[PDB]
Paper text:
The envelope glycoprotein HA of IAV is the major target of neutralizing antibodies. The globular head domain mediates the receptor binding process, and the HA stem leads to virus-cell membrane fusion induced by the low pH in endosomes. The representative antibody 28-12 exhibited broad neutralizing activity against both group 1 and group 2 IAV viruses in vitro and protected mice against H3N2 and H1N1 virus challenge in vivo. Our two cryo-EM structures showed that the 28-12 Fab specifically recognizes the conserved HA stem region for both H3 and H1.
To provide the structural basis of the unique recognition pattern, we determined the cryo-EM structures of the 28-12 Fab in complex with the trimeric HAs from HK/68 H3 and WA/11 H1 at 3.7-Å- and 3.5-Å-resolutions, respectively, with imposed C3 symmetry. To overcome the preferred orientation problem (preferred top-view orientation) associated with the 28-12-H3 complex, also seen in the H3N2 Hong Kong HA trimer (HK/68 H3), we adopted the stage-tilt strategy for data collection. In contrast, H3 contributes only two epitope residues outside helix A to interact with 28-12. Specifically, H3 D19HA2 on the fusion peptide forms hydrogen bonds with T57HCDR2 and Y112HCDR3, and H3 W21HA2 on the fusion peptide forms hydrophobic interactions with V109HCDR3. Notably, H3 has a unique epitope residue, N49HA2, which forms strong hydrogen bonds with C102, N106, Y108, and V109 on HCDR3. Overall, the atom-to-atom contact numbers between 28-12 and H1 or H3 helix A are 144 and 191, respectively. It is worth noting that the H3 residue N49HA2 contributes much more contact numbers with 28-12 than the substitute residues T49HA2 (10) of H1. The site-directed mutational binding assay also confirmed that N49HA2 is critical for H3 HA binding to 28-12, while T49AHA2 did not affect the binding between H1 HA and 28-12. We synthesized 6 peptides with single substitution mutations from H3 to H1 and found that the binding ability decreased significantly when there was a mutation from N to T at position 49 of HA2 compared with the wild-type peptide. Nevertheless, the continuous epitope within the helix A of H3N2 HA makes the major contribution to the binding of 28-12. However, cleavage of H3 HA0 may not change the overall epitope structure, therefore the cleaved H3 HA still maintains the reactivity to 28-12.
Residue numbers in the entry:
A (entry chain J): 1 to 214
B (entry chain A): 276 to 327
C (entry chain B), D (entry chain E), E (entry chain F): 7, 9 to 172
F (entry chain A): 9 to 110
G (entry chain G): 1 to 229
The structure:
Amino acid sequence: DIQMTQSPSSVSASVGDRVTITCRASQGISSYLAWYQLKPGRAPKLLIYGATRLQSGVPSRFSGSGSGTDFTLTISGLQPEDFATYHCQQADSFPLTFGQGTRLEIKRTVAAPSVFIFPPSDEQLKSGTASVVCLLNNFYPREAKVQWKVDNALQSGNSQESVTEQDSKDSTYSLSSTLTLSKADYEKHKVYACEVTHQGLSSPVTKSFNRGEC
Amino acid sequence: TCISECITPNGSIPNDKPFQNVNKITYGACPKYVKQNTLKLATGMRNVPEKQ
Amino acid sequence: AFIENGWEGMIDGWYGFRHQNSEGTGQAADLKSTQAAIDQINGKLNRVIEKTNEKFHQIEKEFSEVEGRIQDLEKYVEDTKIDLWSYNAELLVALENQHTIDLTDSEMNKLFEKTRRQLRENAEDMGNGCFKIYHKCDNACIESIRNGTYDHDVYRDEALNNRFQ
Amino acid sequence: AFIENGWEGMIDGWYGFRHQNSEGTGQAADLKSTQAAIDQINGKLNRVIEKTNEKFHQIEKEFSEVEGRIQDLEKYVEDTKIDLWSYNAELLVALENQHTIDLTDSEMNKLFEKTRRQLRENAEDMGNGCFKIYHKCDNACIESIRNGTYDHDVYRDEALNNRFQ
Amino acid sequence: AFIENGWEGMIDGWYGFRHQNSEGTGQAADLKSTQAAIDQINGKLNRVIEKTNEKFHQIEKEFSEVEGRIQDLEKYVEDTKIDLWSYNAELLVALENQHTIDLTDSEMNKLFEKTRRQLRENAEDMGNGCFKIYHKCDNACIESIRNGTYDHDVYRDEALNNRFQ
Amino acid sequence: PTATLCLGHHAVPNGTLVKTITDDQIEVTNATELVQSSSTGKICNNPHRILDGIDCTLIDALLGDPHCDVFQNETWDLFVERSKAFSNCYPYDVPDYASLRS
Amino acid sequence: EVQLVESGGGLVQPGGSLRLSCAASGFTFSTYNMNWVRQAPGKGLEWLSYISTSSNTIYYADSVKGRFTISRDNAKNSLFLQMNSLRDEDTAVYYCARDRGCSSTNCYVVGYYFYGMDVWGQGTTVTVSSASTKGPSVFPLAPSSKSTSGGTAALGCLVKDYFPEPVTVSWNSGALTSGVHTFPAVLQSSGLYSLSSVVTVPSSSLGTQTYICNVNHKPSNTKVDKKVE
């Protein structure tokens, strides 16, 4: 199956900059390439059809060209209300394999994230479960590394996390790493910690707490 | 002091073109005034650009 | 557009050939089919852009003082012939651009017919505008089909032993 | 009209193929040549029937009271621009219907060229728009020429043993 | 113009054939392709030179007494529609002569296709508009391809022994 | 034996879109613009004899305005009337102003 | 105007059967082609099927393998998307789109899907899970002083083991909205969703300002309020 390889995975640019989004293939889709504007919680809209012409209703801030396999989505009229994820659809031929998609974000200043942690309360330990929450706020970009260690030993395969969307005013992000524990596993271990690795931090800042300090 | 076979009120234009969009009031050997400003007459084949 | 791609390095003509044999590669513009196409292209230009002007006394087309019916007649008269010349501009130049693509397709079809009338039992097409020569073709053989002086009976016994075998 | 007859049962496209082998018969519309023809047909429509209107203030064209020379002047221009638009209607639409038959002939010629560039040593024409395949062609072989993914070197050794023998 | 020369002695039609065999030579006009071409030629005449006149009351176009603005309006009115009819005369008749050369090329291409759909394995082209028949073709064989009643499977085993050998 | 003979055309990387019948915009190798969208900004005095009506119009030279005394028995081919022209004499009225000026 | 309205969604078990709908209005349904494109959570778009106006040219994707059936009716101007042999991977939001047809502005002669799909509907959420409706379990989080020079302290509430998604979580019944971050729900080992919500507050208002994390669930009518202190 032909895979619509896009490059890069995410573009960070401010208002007024030029965005270059590429989407290659393995055959001739010079007149059979469709670009869409996918938004979270909204219906998709056809941006550029046939990789050469503009869809009606869309203003002239967007542009694009390319035939054979090389294509370029050039946005010289980028507005702050037009930040969304774009995808390329192959129309020649069936099956209609979609691309990976490039998430367009606003270029902001890299700030130092504030490391937070949460011990388990008494309402959760009496129910028969346990969970350690590691909160990260005010970090940019989303490429942040977070690792877990229990009693000077790293663990994996039992941790989850959630990433918030981009704010419209502060343009920040939030991350809450949740570790899955139980009632018997909480009394077995004593020391819990959360490693925070960020590009803006000159030293890895971590927090630790004991099981008896709830 | 120049040579021009067509006179127009917004600047004289040469008469080597069949149409114009400068002004409707003309004098002499002038092109015809049309509302279409873009008339790209192709002088060759279509652009087919290489694969690699 | 069944030509897959043209030649960007050939800037000495509108058409030509790209040879490839043991003596090397290269591009050479055809002196026959290119000159026969410019006579059809430039003949379309001089009957439109040259000697098509009218030198006569016109009337006033823009007015500052609104008089009434006398100005309302010539306003509908002038706006008609402007739109009639604009409709003829959308009729001529859009058809001249449409015929030029058909002219370059016909000049390619005449070039495919001139090459096809000399390479029946000697070569076959490939599908991308190239011909698969089934015999030895040096630089003199390339210039024989380019100048139209190629012989079919000379290379007949050589290419037929490798075409269907 | 050298196609003897079309296909009335194919209502899912303007063009297509009619296969016939040991796995049965049937009709299938070509997704390549049909869509390439509507882009040339509908492109002729939207530049004529759409965005070709003029919104401006016109004058009185019908009069009940005969005044004289002032009404005789505007009547001669109005009867001309109606006849000039009628002559352009007999110039455009009659040529657009003439080019559409030439467009469907060119789309058939491009379909005959796309099929002809893959069936040189594998098949031959019959005379009624059909190709006589000299090898085994199943339903996957029909869809290979329909989608343009047919290979000439694969079925070369099979059909050449039954073409001239 | 790839026909090298026509036939001046054939005055009984626009098209035809020139046969040459053991029973002598001669020229014979094709009754099929000539009549199919006049229907396209004479169809272009009667929609232009016939029933295209306008019978109505016109105005005075030439004046001896110069009145002023009333005569200056109709002078620019009359000189435009004369030039508009002259531009349409240079648009129609120049394209009608251009399409007629393309019509005679298409009627020759249909004649080459009608002869090509019956002489695939029986004959080959020569390069000057003539076909090299590789089998015995008498006067009845010439009239079979002229009337379109030629059979390909009859003369298949005779011409294939001398085409590639 | 064995060779390769291709039949192609010239390709230009920097083309422009044209207007045709089948499509709306299609890039070609080379194309010219038949509409003069630019001008020199100044009127040339050759080959036509251009007259400069700086202080007078055409009617002011015909009636005898004192600001056009240099146009005595002067012939021309095209009269250029400026927008800043004015009359500094006895005022006149021309009924059917486009009649006598033409 | 042109608008596509989807229907037939809801909650189903892995192994059931449904029949989606695509209500069309504002245009002639018997002249345009239809399709079926979904949107998987965490992945991109995925084309499934395609139908024509003549109902003779029907195509399917590689992941379908005949498990789905797509039909239409010109008398009702709607689609019939039959869903059979479902699994946990098919839990996504389904959409129906209309093909463009040509390369011009307005396609008076409709062609095929070779020039994108300019019409998209709102879509409906189809959840395929064997878990039933379960109320949320609110667990508070005890805050603590972390930033010495800044003097800030974070606090929140954990909404775990609920079904189905989503749950509108706020603070003080919508009174505290500044600095509130809503995290998306993630899948657990038991198949139930779980999210969280925090709010940036200074450390001076820990023992004075009362922070009540309100949790309200619509289809289960469960309202559990836990004080965060």
